[PDB]
Design a binder for this molecule. Structure first.
Ligand SMILES: O=C(c1ccccc1)N1C[C@@H](CO)[C@@H]2Oc3ccccc3[C@@H]21
Ligand SMILES: O=C(c1ccccc1)N1C[C@@H](CO)[C@@H]2Oc3ccccc3[C@@H]21
Ligand SMILES: [Zn+2]
Ligand SMILES: [Zn+2]
Ligand SMILES: [Zn+2]
Ligand SMILES: [Zn+2]
Lengths: 360, 360
C-alpha cells in the first residue's frame, strides 16, 4: 500500500471512531455529529499532510532495515498514521485558534473556519478546543497498551506547550518587552530594538519548529521503538534548523507571493510582525532607510505598506536570502552526516524532510 | 496544617515551578514571565477553590482511616493539592475561553481577562491555551513516578473532552438541531421544542458536572490509591446529580440575583439559553404564556427581558424549585447511603460536597 492512501484511510477510520464514540458515550445527536464531522474535515483536510506523512516516512525507513512479522509491520504503519493524524489535528487546533486570534480572512484559498456562516467565533474557539482534545482521545484509544504511550504523551504535551509559548512570543513580537503589562494597552515598538536575529529565532523555534519538524521526527522514532538509533540532541538541532528555514520562506512569501498562489492576502507588514524581511532589512539599512521603515511599518494604509515593500525590494534581500540558504544547506548537510553515524535510515528520512522543505 | 493554607502554599510552589521552567527551558524573558504570572493569578485565583479543595478533602478523609508514615501523609496531601490545582487551572482555561466566546463583560466582579487593556482577545485565547497546557506540565512533573499517573491523565483527558462537548451542547442549545449547518447562519429556534428536561440535563451533565464534581472526587480517590473503596458507577451518579443541582441554582441566580451579588449582569434571557427557568416555565405554561415567551425571549431589548422575568415570577417557579430540591435531597441521600457500604469516609466527603452545594 502507498503511504498516502494508507494515511488517508486511517483518517476515515479515526473519524468514524471519534464520531461513533460521541454517539455511544457522549449522548450526541446526528445533527451535531454531522457538524463535528464537517468541522473535522474542513479544518484537518486539504493541506499537504507534510507533518503527518513525516511520521509515516520515518517509520517506513525503519521497517526497511528491521526484522518484523507482517502483522507487526502493519501495526507499526497503523500507529505511525494515527500518530501523524495527532499532529495534523494539533495543527488544525492551532490554525483555527490563530485565525480567530489574528482576524484572518482566508487560509489555503478558503474562508477561515470561524467565518463560515453557521460557525461563528463563539463556536469556533470551542471547535479548536475539541480538535486538540481529539488528539488525546486518539492516543489513549489506539496506543492503550503500547510501550511508547508514556513517552509519546509526554513529548506531545511538551511540543503543544512549546507551541503555545511560541504563539505568545509571536503575538507580542511588536511590543517593547519592558512595556508588557496586562493593565496597559500595548503600543507598537517605535525603536524596533527587539527585531533581532536572536529574538526572531526564538519566535520561530517555539511557534513552528517543535510541532512541524521535531514532533513528526520523534514520533516516527517512538512508534518504531527506535529512539536509541539516534542522538536526540542532533535530532533537535536539525529540526530547529530546518524549521527556521521553513519560516523564513513563509515570511518571504507573505510579502512577495501573489495572493491566489499564497492562499491568502499576506498582512505581516500591517500586523508589524517580526518577519525575516524586517529583521534582515534592519540588519543592513542605513539611517534614512530605518527612518522610512519606522514611519510606514505596522499600518493598514496601503500606501505605507507599498513603501515597506519598495524598501525591501530596493534593499536586495534576495542576496541575504541566498546567503542564508547557503549556510542552512551547509549546516543541514553537516547534521545529516552526524546522524548517519547511528542511523543511516533516519539520516535519509531527515534528508527527505530537508528536500521537501528546500524545494517546495 | 489547615487544608486551605496547604492548598494555597502549593499554588505558590507550582507557580514558581512553571515560571522557573519557562526561564530555564523555554527561553523566556522577565517581562513575559511577569505577564504569565499575572495572567495565572488573575485567572486562577479569587474564587472559592471548591473544586481543588474537594480533592484535598477526599484525600484527608482517607488519611484519617489508613495507616501511613508521616512522609506518606505529606506526599498524599501534596499530590491532592497539585491535583486540585490541575482542576482549578482547567476551569480557568474554560472561563477565559468561555468569556471570549460569549462576549462576557465581567466575572466575579472583575473584568473578564480578555478585556484587560494589555491583554486583548488575540493574546487571551492563547493565554487560555497555556492555562490548560500547564495542567499537563504539573502532572508530568509532580506525578512522574506515581502509580496513579496513567489513570489520572486518562481521567483528566476524558473530563476535559466531556467539558468541550458540553460547551458545544450549550452554545448550540437555542438552535434547532435539524438546522445546524456550518454553511448557514443559525436562526434561533421559534418552537423551543428542544427546551426539554432530557436536553437540559445533557447540557449540564457535560458542560459542568464532569469537571466540577466527578473530576475532584475521582482525583481524590486516585491520589489516595483508594479507587477500590468505591463503586465508580455510584460516584458517577451522585456527581451527575449534585452537579445538575448546582447548575439549576446558577440558572436561577442569573435571572434573579442582584448583579453586585452575582459578580456580573446575567444575560441568559437575551442569549436565549436553555436554562432551568425556561425549561420549567415551558413545562407548566399555558398557550398564551408560551406565546408571550416566544415573542420576548432571546432579545437584547430590556423591555422584552423584563416581560420574560415577569413571566417567570408570575409562573410560581419557586414552587417547582422547592419540589426539585426535595427530590434531589432524596436521591443524593440515597446515593450517600449506597456509598457507605464500601466507604463511609468517601460517603462523608460526598455529604460535605452536597452540603456546600445545597447551602451556599
Ligand atoms: O538570513 C540571514 C543570514 C544568516 C547567515 C548567513 C547569511 C544570511 N540572517 C542573519 C540576520 C541578518 O539580519 C537575520 O537573522 C536571522 C535569524 C534567523 C534566520 C535568518 C536570519 C537573518
Ligand atoms: O425542577 C424540576 C423538578 C423535577 C422533579 C421534581 C420536581 C421538580 N424539573 C423537571 C422539569 C420541569 O419542567 C425540568 O427539567 C429539569 C431537568 C433537570 C433538572 C431540573 C429540571 C426541571
Ligand atoms: Zn498568528
Ligand atoms: Zn506567515
Ligand atoms: Zn458560555
Ligand atoms: Zn449561568
Amino acid at each position: 500500500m502507498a503511504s498516502m492512501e494508507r494515511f488517508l484511510s486511517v483518517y476515515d477510520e479515526v473519524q468514524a471512531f471519534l464520531l461513533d464514540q460521541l454517539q455511544s458515550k457522549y449522548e450526541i445527536d446526528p445533527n451535531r455529529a454531522r457538524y463535528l464531522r464537517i468541522m473535522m474535515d474542513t479544518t484537518c483536510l486539504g493541506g499537504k499532510y507534510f507533518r503527518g506523512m513525516t511520521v509515516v516516512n520515518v517509520a517506513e525507513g525503519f521497517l526497511a532495515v528491521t526484522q518484523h512479522d507482517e502483522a507487526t509491520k502493519e501495526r507499526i504503519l497503523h500507529d505511525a498514521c494515527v500518530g501523524g493524524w495527532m499532529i495534523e489535528f494539533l495543527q488544525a487546533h492551532y490554525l483555527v485558534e490563530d485565525d480567530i486570534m489574528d482576524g484572518s480572512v482566508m487560509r489555503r484559498g478558503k474562508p477561515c473556519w470561524y467565518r463560515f456562516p453557521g460557525v461563528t467565533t463563539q463556536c469556533a474557539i470551542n471547535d479548536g478546543i475539541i480538535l486538540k482534545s481529539w488528539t488525546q482521545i486518539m492516543a489513549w484509544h489506539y496506543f492503550a497498551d503500547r510501550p511508547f504511550l508514556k513517552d509519546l504523551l509526554c513529548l506531545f504535551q511538551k511540543v503543544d506547550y512549546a507551541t503555545a509559548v511560541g504563539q505568545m512570543y509571536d503575538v507580542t513580537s511588536m511590543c517593547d518587552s519592558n512595556k508588557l503589562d496586562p493593565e496597559v494597552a500595548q503600543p507598537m515598538t517605535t525603536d524596533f530594538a527587539e527585531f533581532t536575529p536572536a529574538i526572531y529565532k526564538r519566535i520561530v523555534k517555539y511557534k513552528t519548529t517543535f510541532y512541524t519538524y521535531l514532533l513528526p521526527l520523534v514520533m516516527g522514532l517512538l512508534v518504531s521503538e527506535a529512539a536509541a538509533s539516534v542522538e536526540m540532541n542532533l535530532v533537535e538541532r536539525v529540526a530547529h534548523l530546518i524549521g527556521e528555514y521553513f519560516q523564513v520562506q513563509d515570511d518571504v512569501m507573505d510579502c512577495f507571493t501573489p495572493p491566489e498562489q499564497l492562499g491568502k492576502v499576506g498582512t505581516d507588514i500591517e500586523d508589524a510582525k517580526c518577519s525575516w524581511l524586517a529583521v534582515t532589512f534592519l540588519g543592513k539599512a542605513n539611517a534614512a532607510q530605518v527612518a522610512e521603515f519606522k514611519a510606514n511599518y505596522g499600518e493598514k494604509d496601503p500606501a505605507k505598506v507599498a513603501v515597506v515593500k519598495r524598501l525591501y525590494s530596493k534593499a536586495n534581500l534576495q542576496a541575504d536570502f541566498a546567503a542564508y540558504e547557503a549556510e542552512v544547506v551547509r549546516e543541514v548537510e553537516s547534521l545529516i552526516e552526524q546522524l548517519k553515524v547511528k542511523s543511516p535510515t533516519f539520516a535519509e528520512s531527515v534528508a527527505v524532510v530537508w528536500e521537501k522543505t528546500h524545494k517546495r
